[PDB]
Amino acid sequence: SEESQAFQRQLTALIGYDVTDVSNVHDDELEFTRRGLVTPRMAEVASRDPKLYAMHPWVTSKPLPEYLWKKIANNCIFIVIHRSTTSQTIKVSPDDTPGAILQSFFTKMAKQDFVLRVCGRDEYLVGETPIKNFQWVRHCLKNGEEIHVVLDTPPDPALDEVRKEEWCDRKFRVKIRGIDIPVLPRNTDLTVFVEANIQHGQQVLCQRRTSPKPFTEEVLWNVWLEFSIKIKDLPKGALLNLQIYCRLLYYVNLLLIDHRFLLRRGEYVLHMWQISGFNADKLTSATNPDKENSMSISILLDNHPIARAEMPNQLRKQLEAIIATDPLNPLTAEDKELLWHFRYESLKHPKAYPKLFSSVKWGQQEIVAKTYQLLARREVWDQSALDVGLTMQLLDCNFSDENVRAIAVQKLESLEDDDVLHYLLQLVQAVKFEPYHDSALARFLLKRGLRNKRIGHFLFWFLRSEIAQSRHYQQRFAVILEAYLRGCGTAMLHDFTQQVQVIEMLQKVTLDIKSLSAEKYDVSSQVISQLKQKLENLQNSQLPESFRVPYDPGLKAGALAIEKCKVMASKKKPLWLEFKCADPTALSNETIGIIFKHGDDLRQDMLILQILRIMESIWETESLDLCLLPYGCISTGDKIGMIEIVKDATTIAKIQQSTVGNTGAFKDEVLNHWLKEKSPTEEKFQAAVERFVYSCAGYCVATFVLGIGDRHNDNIMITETGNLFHIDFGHERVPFVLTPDFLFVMGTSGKKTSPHFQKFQDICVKAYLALRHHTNLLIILFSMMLMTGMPQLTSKEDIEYIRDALTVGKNEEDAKKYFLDQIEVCRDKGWTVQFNWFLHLVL
Ligand SMILES: COc1cncc(N2CCc3nc(NC(C)=O)sc3C2)n1
Numbered sequence: 001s002e003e004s005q006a007f008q009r010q011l012t013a014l015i016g017y018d019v020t021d022v023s024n025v026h027d028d029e030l031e032f033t034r035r036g037l038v039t040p041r042m043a044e045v046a047s048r049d050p051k052l053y054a055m056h057p058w059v060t061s062k063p064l065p066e067y068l069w070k071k072i073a074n075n076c077i078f079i080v081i082h083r084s085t086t087s088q089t090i091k092v093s094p095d096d097t098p099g100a101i102l103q104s105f106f107t108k109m110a111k112q113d114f115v116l117r118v119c120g121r122d123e124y125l126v127g128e129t130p131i132k133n134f135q136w137v138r139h140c141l142k143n144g145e146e147i148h149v150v151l152d153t154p155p156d157p158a159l160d161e162v163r164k165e166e167w168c169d170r171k172f173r174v175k176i177r178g179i180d181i182p183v184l185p186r187n188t189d190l191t192v193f194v195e196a197n198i199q200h201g202q203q204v205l206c207q208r209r210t211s212p213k214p215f216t217e218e219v220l221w222n223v224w225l226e227f228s229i230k231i232k233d234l235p236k237g238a239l240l241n242l243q244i245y246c247r248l249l250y251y252v253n254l255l256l257i258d259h260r261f262l263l264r265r266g267e268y269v270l271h272m273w274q275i276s277g278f279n280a281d282k283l284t285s286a287t288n289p290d291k292e293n294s295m296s297i298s299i300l301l302d303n304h305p306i307a308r309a310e311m312p313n314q315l316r317k318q319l320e321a322i323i324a325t326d327p328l329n330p331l332t333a334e335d336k337e338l339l340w341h342f343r344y345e346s347l348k349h350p351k352a353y354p355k356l357f358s359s360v361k362w363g364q365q366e367i368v369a370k371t372y373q374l375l376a377r378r379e380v381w382d383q384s385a386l387d388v389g390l391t392m393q394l395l396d397c398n399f400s401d402e403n404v405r406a407i408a409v410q411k412l413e414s415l416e417d418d419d420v421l422h423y424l425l426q427l428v429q430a431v432k433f434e435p436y437h438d439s440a441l442a443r444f445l446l447k448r449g450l451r452n453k454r455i456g457h458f459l460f461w462f463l464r465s466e467i468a469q470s471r472h473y474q475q476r477f478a479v480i481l482e483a484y485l486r487g488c489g490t491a492m493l494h495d496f497t498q499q500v501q502v503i504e505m506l507q508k509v510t511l512d513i514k515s516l517s518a519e520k521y522d523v524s525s526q527v528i529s530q531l532k533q534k535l536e537n538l539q540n541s542q543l544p545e546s547f548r549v550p551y552d553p554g555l556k557a558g559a560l561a562i563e564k565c566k567v568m569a570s571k572k573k574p575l576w577l578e579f580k581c582a583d584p585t586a587l588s589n590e591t592i593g594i595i596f597k598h599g600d601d602l603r604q605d606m607l608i609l610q611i612l613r614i615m616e617s618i619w620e621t622e623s624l625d626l627c628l629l630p631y632g633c634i635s636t637g638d639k640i641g642m643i644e645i646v647k648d649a650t651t652i653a654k655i656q657q658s659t660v661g662n663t664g665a666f667k668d669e670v671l672n673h674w675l676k677e678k679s680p681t682e683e684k685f686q687a688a689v690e691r692f693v694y695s696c697a698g699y700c701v702a703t704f705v706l707g708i709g710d711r712h713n714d715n716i717m718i719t720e721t722g723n724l725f726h727i728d729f730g731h732e733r734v735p736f737v738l739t740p741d742f743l744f745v746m747g748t749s750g751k752k753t754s755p756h757f758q759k760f761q762d763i764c765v766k767a768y769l770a771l772r773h774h775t776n777l778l779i780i781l782f783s784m785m786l787m788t789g790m791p792q793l794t795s796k797e798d799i800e801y802i803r804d805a806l807t808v809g810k811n812e813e814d815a816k817k818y819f820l821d822q823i824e825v826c827r828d829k830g831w832t833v834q835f836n837w838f839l840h841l842v843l
Contacts, residue, residue: 007163011485014496016468016637017478024289026268029259030479033438037483038167040443044450045487050157054491055115055124056453058135060418064094066623071141077131079147081105082119095130119148120586121554126154135418142625150585160489168231168303172198172256175300176210178220179244182293190215190246194297196225197241198234198256198363201400205229205238205363215246231263231303235362237400237435239285242270242297250274250295253285259436261307271296273472278795280432280788281472283397289471306365308344319345323352326808327393327779328800331355343374350384354393357404368401375403386411388423389777395430395441396784402435409440417452422617424455425610426781428462429788437476446480450487457553459484460496465603465635498547503636505543506575509534510596510640514573523567531575535562546582549592551632551644557592558582564591572599576645593645600730602641605633607789608706608729611781615702615771622770626698626763627691629725648721652741653714664838666831668749671718671741678720688722689745693756695724697763700736704822705771705778707801709736712837734833738826750830761823765816772815775806 012018019034072094079101080089088108092101098116116125118136131137140147176194192215198205208225240254250272256264271288272295273281288294311319319342322335331339336359339346346352361367394408412420412427420427424445431442449456463481467474485493512534517527539560549555558580566576578591612630619626632644655674656666675692679685695718703709703726710733711726718724726737740750747754771778782802786793793799807815 001166004166010493010497011482014485014493014500015478015481016464017474019475019478019482024287024475026270026287027258029255029285029437030475032259033436034479034482035167036438037443037446037479038165038486040447041450041483041487042165044447045162045489048451050160051154052127053451053453053489054155054157054160055126057124057127057129058454059127059129060133060135060138061416062418062620064132064138065620065625067625068138068141077147079131079149081116082148082150083109092131094132097128097130098125099128101131114151115154116149117152117585118554119150120581120583120588122548122556122583123554124154125149148587155491159491161491162487162489165486170231170303172206172227172229172231172234172303173224174227174240176221176223176225177298177300178218178222179295179297180218181295182217184215184217192219192244192246194221195243195245197239197243198227198229199239199241199400200235200237200362201358201398203358203362203398203400212246229363232306233363233365234263235365235368235400236261236402238362239283239400239435240264242272242299244272244295244297248275251282252287252297253283254299255285255435259438261305263301263303263305265301265303267298267300269296269298277792278787279790279792280397280429281470283433284472285435285437286472286475311342311345315342316345323349323355325355326803327354327389327776328783328803331359335359343370347374347377348380350381350387350390353381353390353407354398357394357401358398362401372403375407378407381407382410386414388415388419389774389780392423392426392430392780392784393776395427395433396780397433397787399433400435405434406440409444412441412444417448417455420448420452420455421458422610422614424458425462425606426784428459428466429607429784431476431480432473432788437479442480446483449484453488453492454553456484456488456492457495457548457550460488461550461634461636465606465641468637469603469635495548498544499550502544502547503550503642505538506577506596506642507598507637507640509538510573510575510598513567513575514598517567517573519571521569521571523569523573527567531565531567532562535560535565535577549594549632550634550636550642555592556582557594561591568595570599572597574599574643578645590647593647595643595645596640597643598640600728601639602633602635602643602730604789605641605729606635607785608708609633611706611778611785612702614777614781615698615705618771618774618777619698619767622766624763624767624770625694626701626767627695627723628698628702629695629719629723631725631727646717646719646725649717649719649723649725651714652716652718652724652739653712655718656713656741664835666739666741666834668740668744672745675722675745689756691722692718692724692745693760694763695722696738696742697760698767699724699726700738700764701767701771701819703736704819705802705805706782707805710734710833711737713737713739713834732829732833734829735822735825737834738823739834740830743827750827761820764823765819768819769812769815772806772812775808778806779803 008020075094077092077094078089079092080087090104117123123136125131125134137147174196176196191212193212194210195207197207206227206229208227210221210223213219234256236257238256240256242252244250252270252272254264254268254270258264271291273288274295319338322339339356339359343356346356360371391408391411394404399405427441427445434441445459449459463477467477467481513527513531516530517523546556546558549557561578561580564578568574568576575596577594577596580591609630612628616628629646631646633641635641655671659670660667675688676685679688708729715728715731716724716726716737743749743757746757746760748757779802783799786799807818
């Protein structure tokens with residue numbers, strides 16, 4: 001069951017999709033997979049330390065960087081502790097444990113077992129890790145801040161309670177019968193054919209077509225299409241891709257071998273996805289839910305079972321050549337035959353693996369078996385250091401083999417939760433490339449989220465973002481989400497509920513406001529009136545008392561600071577919202593700022609931001625900090641989501657719009673003044689000059705690499721404290737934004753050098769060749785990003801921007817001399833493209 005059906009209505013509304021719905025399935029893969037996941041769920045729900053789960057201590061094994069060791073000169077660290085408006089400070093050793101610190105303290109208050117929380121956050125200092133290795137702590141030191149902690153009692157784990165569960169030698173051939181569309185697009189008598197491809201990692205094995213016929217709402221062929229491939233030569237996760245041309249209009253897929261290892265038989269009526277204008281949506285096994293409008297196709301299958309010596313110098317060297325090669329450098333057939341013939345040697349190089357597995361005739365069963373026997377003797381892989389780049393490459397769209405893919409996931413098992421989070425978004429996107437719903441990766445995500453509430457929390461928002469936005473992959477993800485929610489345990493189930501209500505109310509209000517101010521760049525007085533009046537109407541009796549901040553889940557937002565809420569001056573109309581802090585133990589009257597925006601696809605932003613955090617950990621590996629500000633951003637629904645407001649920041653634009661703000665005129669000395677008036681000490685000023693030379697530099701390198709470098713002044717921001725950063729990534733050229741305003745902070749004005757600019761060029765180039773040491777990682781992440789994240793994109797040229805950007809094939813010399821001249825454009829062009837945004841207002 002009676003109540004067991006509410007739970008299911010509870011799940012469905014937290015998901016935003018009904019997994020019990022079967023109107024859009026031509027088999028039971030989804031149901032079977034809802035079934036399959038219970039165990040890995042129940043297994044992980046069975047095996048998690050209830051208290052450690054409840055406190056989700058956030059923590060790393062990485063060393064502390066050179067830079068933050070320079071921040072400590074006593075081998076000793078200060079921590080302020082409070083109980084109830086009593087508070088004292090303790091000199092602690094960087095290697096001290098939490099429990100070990102309770103010893104130095106049960107020494108104090110009085111002259112049972114309690115826990116240390118961060119003041120203001122649902123964030124705890126527990127577990128047998130040294131304080132140096134909690135992430136909050138490294139965070140405090142970086143920004144120059146005290147460590148404040150309250151002694152309370154731990155969260156009862158009975159709040160994590162989980163509801164009790166209740167579970168041939170023939171050639172291949174396919175009868176195409178015809179297609180039907182109800183209403184016809186273009187109407188002038190055109191010409192139309194079907195194309196049917198047998199696929200495996202975009203590797204096309206065989207292809208057949210039809211005779212073309214007149215494109216009328218119904219087109220009937222009734223033809224057998226006999227392929228070259230043999231039934232016994234079909235591989236698992238091979239797709240029957242079916243496409244319609246006149247050129248490409250619609251596409252649809254059918255897994256030829258089903259999730260039971262069963263060849264696929266019978267009649268199918270497939271509703272087809274329509275093209276807009278390669279792309280992960282193209283790969284999907286899902287069918288178009290919109291049956292009323294969509295093109296569809298009828299087919300039939302009547303087709304049961306199935307489940308050394310020493311190499312010469314000059315070839316080794318071709319092989320090593322091949323292997324050295326970047327991910328996107330394609331293999332000649334010469335290349336591939338080499339790789340294969342010498343597969344056992346190729347096996348001793350883990351860098352080879354992607355290249356080697358894309359040198360497999362997956363359309364011969366004989367070869368696949370040899371390939372599986374290859375995968376048997378996996379000593380060398382099994383024992384290699386985890387290379388995420390490498391590992392990820394084996395998860396992309398090029399690899400549709402269950403067992404190749406599965407070796408990559410074996411490697412991920414060894415990631416700590418710290419890193420799981422780094423790549424979590426990209427791993428979640430990688431599911432799009434899994435041929436089946438139920439996959440080792442899916443399972444790995446499921447597992448790891450249930451294991452740790454932080455990962456679980458982000459996993460939720462990531463899956464939900466996609467479910468709500470993408471029809472191609474919402475069924476699959478919805479099944480993985482349900483699986484998660486079923487184990488995350490009631491505490492979280494309530495948190496998610498709080499959150500989902502709030503963000504649904506606030507998007508109502510976001511969109512209603514765009515209706516009102518049409519475009520008219522001004523926000524009428526009446527617009528804020530109503531904005532104000534609604535938020536009063538919303539808190540009244542409806543909104544949650546409080547709630548976790550999806551982008552920063554340690555933070556429980558309280559009530560709204562309605563006085564300070566507003567709408568922004570955009571052509572879009574984003575909401576500027578500020579909330580009180582629900583935690584009354586917190587340190588500040590500083591509100592929680594959140595912007596709500598409809599108008600740009602924010603998945604794209606999420607992806608860039610993540611890559612930014614990765615670049616930042618890469619610089620952590622050379623003891624480098626470049627002070628990037630990858631503020632929080634969460635896609636929640638359709639071209640809509642939320643954003644962290646970064647306190648005490650303005651637009652480079654508005655800094656020009658201060659003294660001038662004209663019809664578009666710029667001045668050089670003005671940034672540097674803005675900083676002086678916001679630096680109560682002259683040190684603090686040069687420290688802002690400081691943070692800026694870094695932030696500026698880092699943002700110069702990263703932006704060039706991704707190719708999002710020619711940006712307006714308006715979409716770059718700086719803090720009152722010197723931290724510059726780009727924003728709004730949903731939105732003569734120039735490689736990046738290094739304006740003349742910037743360089744004058746570096747003691748220079750177009751065509752000279754200085755103490756702080758030599759330093760700028762120093763970091764830049766170091767930063768640049770540091771990323772180049774992780775070239776293949778960035779290539780793979782960017783490539784994947786594009787495929788899962790974007791519009792359409794050319795599966796050569798778009799993808800291939802970044803390898804000329806990272807100046808592949810070159811030496812730290814040539815490469816620096818590449819990047820250095822990229823600077824000496826922004827010195828030639830100065831204002832000239834900055835200048836340009838506006839002029840095109842009419843061009
Ligand atoms: C126009 O909508 C978009 C889209 N993407 C990002 C973005 N910014 C994100 C970070 C950010 N911090 C601010 N702090 C202050 C004090 O104004 S304002 C802002 C807006 N704004």
